[PDB]
Amino acid sequence: ILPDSVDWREKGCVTEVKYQGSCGACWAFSAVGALEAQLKLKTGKLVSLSAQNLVDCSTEKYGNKGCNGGFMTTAFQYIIDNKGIDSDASYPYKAMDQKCQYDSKYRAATCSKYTELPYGREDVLKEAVANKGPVSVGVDARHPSFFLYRSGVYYEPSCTQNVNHGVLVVGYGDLNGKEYWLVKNSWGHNFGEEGYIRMARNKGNHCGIASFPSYPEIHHHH
Amino acid sequence: ILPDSVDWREKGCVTEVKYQGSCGACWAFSAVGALEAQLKLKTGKLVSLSAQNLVDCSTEKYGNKGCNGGFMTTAFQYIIDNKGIDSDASYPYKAMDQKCQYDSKYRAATCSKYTELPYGREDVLKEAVANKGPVSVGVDARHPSFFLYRSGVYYEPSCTQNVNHGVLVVGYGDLNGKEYWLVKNSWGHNFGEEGYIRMARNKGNHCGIASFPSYPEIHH
Numbered sequence: 305i306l307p308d309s310v311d312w313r314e315k316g317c318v319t320e321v322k323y324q325g326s327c328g329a330c331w332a333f334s335a336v337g338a339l340e341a342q343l344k345l346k347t348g349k350l351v352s353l354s355a356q357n358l359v360d361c362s363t364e365k366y367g368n369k370g371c372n373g374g375f376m377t378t379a380f381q382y383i384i385d386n387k388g389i390d391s392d393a394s395y396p397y398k399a400m401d402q403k404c405q406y407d408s409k410y411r412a413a414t415c416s417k418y419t420e421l422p423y424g425r426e427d428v429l430k431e432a433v434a435n436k437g438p439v440s441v442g443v444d445a446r447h448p449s450f451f452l453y454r455s456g457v458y459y460e461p462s463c464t465q466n467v468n469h470g471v472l473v474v475g476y477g478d479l480n481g482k483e484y485w486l487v488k489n490s491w492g493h494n495f496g497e498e499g500y501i502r503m504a505r506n507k508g509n510h511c512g513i514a515s516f517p518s519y520p521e522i523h524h525h526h
Numbered sequence: 527i528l529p530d531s532v533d534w535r536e537k538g539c540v541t542e543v544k545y546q547g548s549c550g551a552c553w554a555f556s557a558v559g560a561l562e563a564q565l566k567l568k569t570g571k572l573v574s575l576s577a578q579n580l581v582d583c584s585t586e587k588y589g590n591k592g593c594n595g596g597f598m599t600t601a602f603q604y605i606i607d608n609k610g611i612d613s614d615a616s617y618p619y620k621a622m623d624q625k626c627q628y629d630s631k632y633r634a635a636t637c638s639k640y641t642e643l644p645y646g647r648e649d650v651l652k653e654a655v656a657n658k659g660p661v662s663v664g665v666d667a668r669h670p671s672f673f674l675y676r677s678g679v680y681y682e683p684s685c686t687q688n689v690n691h692g693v694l695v696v697g698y699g700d701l702n703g704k705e706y707w708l709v710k711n712s713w714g715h716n717f718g719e720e721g722y723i724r725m726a727r728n729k730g731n732h733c734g735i736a737s738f739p740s741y742p743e744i745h746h
């Protein structure tokens with residue numbers, strides 16, 4: 305029976321909140337976050353992975369422009385095709401398009417595949433967050449109410465399914481009746497609740513949270 | 527000799543902070559803000575003017591795409607060419623592109639002209655804020671540090687002169703040595719210090735604040 309609450313931070317599967325600065329690498333942070341959790345689940349070790357690696361090395365090949373944007377799914381693809389990604393420690397974030405410095409010497413994780421969840425299914429998404437781990441998602445963040453959020457459950461009447469900002473669902477619960485998704489952002493500790501936003505859940509796929517959900521799996525890392 | 531500090535709010539020339547919602551109408555808010563001040567200076571009455579008027583009616587002919595962006599200068603142009611703009615009360619903000627609904631009977635201010643200030647001149651900008659009134663400016667606000675500002679003087683090392691966001695300089699001063707521009711934003715009271723951000727001043731045209739400054743006048 306799915307529990308009332310899930311917080312993957314409690315189970316040591318979520319790294320410190322990152323700060324993307326002026327570089328539009330929200331997709332890179334969403335993807336590394338999801339795989340960070342799958343890494344902790346397989347190896348028992350929590351290691352920040354290199355978002356910089358995805359900005360530098362996951363480019364033209366499918367459809368990523370580094371600091372000018374990209375997709376979580378194609379970021380997973382690159383990790384499969386390269387059979388690796390470097391630790392953040394070995395390949396630190398500098399918030400700019402640099403030349404590829406990928407190689408397997410400071411490799412910290414791999415990826416065998418990734419699963420796209422069905423559009424708008426907030427009951428499926430809840431099952432995935434409970435039983436598989438954090439889930440990469442897009443949200444609609446066009447609304448100043450999003451960047452201004454400080455606490456509580458976020459409900460924006462004017463929100464849409466036309467998502468534009470990659471983030472990571474690390475859990476779910478209820479604040480005194482009001483049901484929510486626990487979302488890790490890449491805007492540093494000063495955004496929302498130490499870098500998290502609780503977003504309205506079971507309220508009509510609010511801001512398209514359940515529009516484009518994906519999670520990677522590590523069948524055999526070495 | 528110009529004063530060390532200026533805050534146009536002290537002299538009742540600045541309306542409540544507005545909230546643009548999902549519509550990229552920052553330019554429309556910047557323009558009405560500047561004219562709001564000139565209106566109070568001429569008539570002695572503080573009246574919120576219609577940003578929605580500029581979004582609906584200052585469009586293709588003025589190089590403006592409503593909720594997808596525009597310029598304060600061409601917004602002023604439209605007010606001159608239309609020979610007025612409606613009050614916010616008569617023509618409320620709806621944060622979407624509507625068809626023009628301008629009515630001359632609810633006209634609340636006019637505009638005889640506008641002055642573009644020279645690129646990067648933070649000494650000229652200071653002279654205009656001191657002697658003329660609040661100044662419409664563009665800033666670079668692409669940086670999460672900008673949206674997330676809570677208090678103090680804003681300095682972002684990664685900031686550029688590639689401005690993307692219309693705001694209004696309502697004054698200047700220094701907080702404990704650090705010189706600043708007092709900037710009114712259109713993101714409601716919960717942004718920054720009740721809707722204001724103090725931005726680094728005399729620090730290399732920081733975030734292109736002095737890149738494209740303009741102010742309107744109501745002459746005759």
Ligand SMILES: N[C@@H]1CCc2nc(-c3ccccc3)ncc2C1
Binds near residue numbers: 553597599663692693
């Ligand atoms: N000669 C024009 C004068 C006005 C202007 N205004 C902007 C701007 C203002 C607000 C928001 C986004 C761009 N950019 C460029 C220019 C150049």
